[PDB]
Design an enzyme around this catalytic site. Structure first.
Site, mmCIF file in Angstrom:
data_model
loop_
_atom_site.group_PDB
_atom_site.id
_atom_site.type_symbol
_atom_site.label_atom_id
_atom_site.label_comp_id
_atom_site.label_asym_id
_atom_site.label_seq_id
_atom_site.Cartn_x
_atom_site.Cartn_y
_atom_site.Cartn_z
ATOM 1 C CD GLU C 63 -3.421 1.230 1.822
ATOM 2 O OE1 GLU C 63 -3.622 0.128 1.964
ATOM 3 O OE2 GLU C 63 -3.868 2.221 1.700
ATOM 4 N NE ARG C 91 7.728 -18.154 -3.847
ATOM 5 C CZ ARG C 91 7.943 -19.299 -4.314
ATOM 6 N NH1 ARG C 91 8.797 -20.165 -3.927
ATOM 7 N NH2 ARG C 91 7.408 -19.329 -5.525
ATOM 8 N N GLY C 108 -7.469 6.354 -14.135
ATOM 9 C CA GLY C 108 -8.504 6.958 -14.464
ATOM 10 C C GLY C 108 -8.530 8.558 -13.915
#
Lengths: 143, 140, 141, 143
Positions: C63, C91, C108
């Site tokens: 993030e 993993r 956009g």
């Protein structure tokens, strides 16, 4: 080459008949060494009530081609079960047919993760999805 | 209340005729103060070739009922656009009908988040989904 | 190219200091025409109790780089808000640094969708993530 | 009922010491029959530059409390691995502590699905998340 089962497009499409897959006009359409594609028409069968491809039905297409793909990457006697899916809708589609391509992100012993990109007939990305599958052994007695 | 538009189930079901919604046998089936439901049969329109409810079609049910709910929570001149959705499939369903209930998580000015829970006729949860919608002002 | 803001790695790291980003030892590490990366050590600051990198922390990294990438694709007076994120862990990771590369999926007018891949030192994919951002115009918001 | 391991909140907090959990100031804070909670401060350790709680760090808190909860429902000898997670960020948080509650949605033989809701000290909902876990067995030799 990714596949562990042998198949033809014609045989895949026959397997999918009389189901939600054929009901929605979905057709398994092309494959390569490490990807496989399905198409679907944008029409009254697949549109939401305002003349555009129903976003939820796009996800139906993604889960279909990803689960199929996942099973074809396993030897006979094993297959997959859908655990979860997520998707972003990137743009509306009003006409033509869309094409979903499934490509593997990780093929584990127990878990597979697949990417499905759905594109319009103009080759614009209209939906992106990721699917998580469980690998199951079909010979286990309880099913 | 939650709802900002006036509506009836008959009207809603007419709006959905001759679309993916009717094509999948989905019916808008009930509503309350802050929830609304739609039903769908588990049959050859909605199953995997191998005879269980197609998990992708459960998502179609979820997006149908959540987007409809989202639009009903807006005044005229405003509507919603599906931005994203995710779901977990919790158990196989082989027959009967399933019921999807949409309830709001957060209705913001620009973004709505909706919960959809889909249950079997035995009242068991078979699929959970969260749906994110974009709020659009058509005339303004 | 992709970027609408001028920037240097040094400037980006400084802006991120005294926050969760620096607290996690995350460093903005490289960029190209259409991707940007951050690195993060696997040690006691970032491991779950049984000695592997903490999945949640890996998502914090994703993030982080995705949101920064998003903001650099906008003109001045505009920025992004995290709306949602999802990830699969592929993993376990027991040492070294992991690297997160953000690449755009769709940019956009009002929404940006970003892909984030996280890889270990031996270039193994350990986490894949998609992040959805809201574009805000600071001058009316 | 839900819990299969015996535990106290002190045990759990001991277990999380000297890890990402402690590093982020996360504290296991309450539990009931069907759920468990953890708190985390919103300060410089956990905020993004813009001065609000870092959304990625919220997900770290959610994954923390859900995974711990997941292991506590399993007999000794078994635990969980994170498979995937998703979250929506519903509102900015700029001070105090947040509280995350993990409540189970479905617990399977091999797969668990958990709800995590995160709230501010005003009890405003700031983040909702769903976590999927894989059940593993630690007691297999050899093997």
């Amino acid at each position: 080459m990714l596949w562990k089962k042998t198949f033809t497009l014609e045989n895949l499409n026959q397997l999918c008949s009389n189901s939600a897959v054929s009901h929605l006009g979905i057709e398994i359409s092309a494959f390569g060494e490490d990807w496989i594609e399905a198409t679907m028409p944008v029409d009254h069968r697949t549109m939401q009530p305002f003349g555009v491809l129903h976003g939820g039905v796009s996800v139906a297409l993604a889960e279909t081609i990803g689960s199929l793909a996942g099973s074809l990457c396993l030897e006979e006697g094993k297959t997959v079960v859908g655990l979860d899916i997520n998707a972003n809708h990137l743009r509306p589609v009003r006409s033509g047919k869309v094409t979903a391509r499934a490509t593997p992100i990780n093929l584990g012993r127990n878990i597979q993760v697949w990417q499905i990109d759905i594109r319009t007939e103009e080759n614009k990305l209209c939906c992106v999805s990721r699917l998580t599958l469980s690998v199951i052994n079909l010979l286990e007695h309880h099913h």
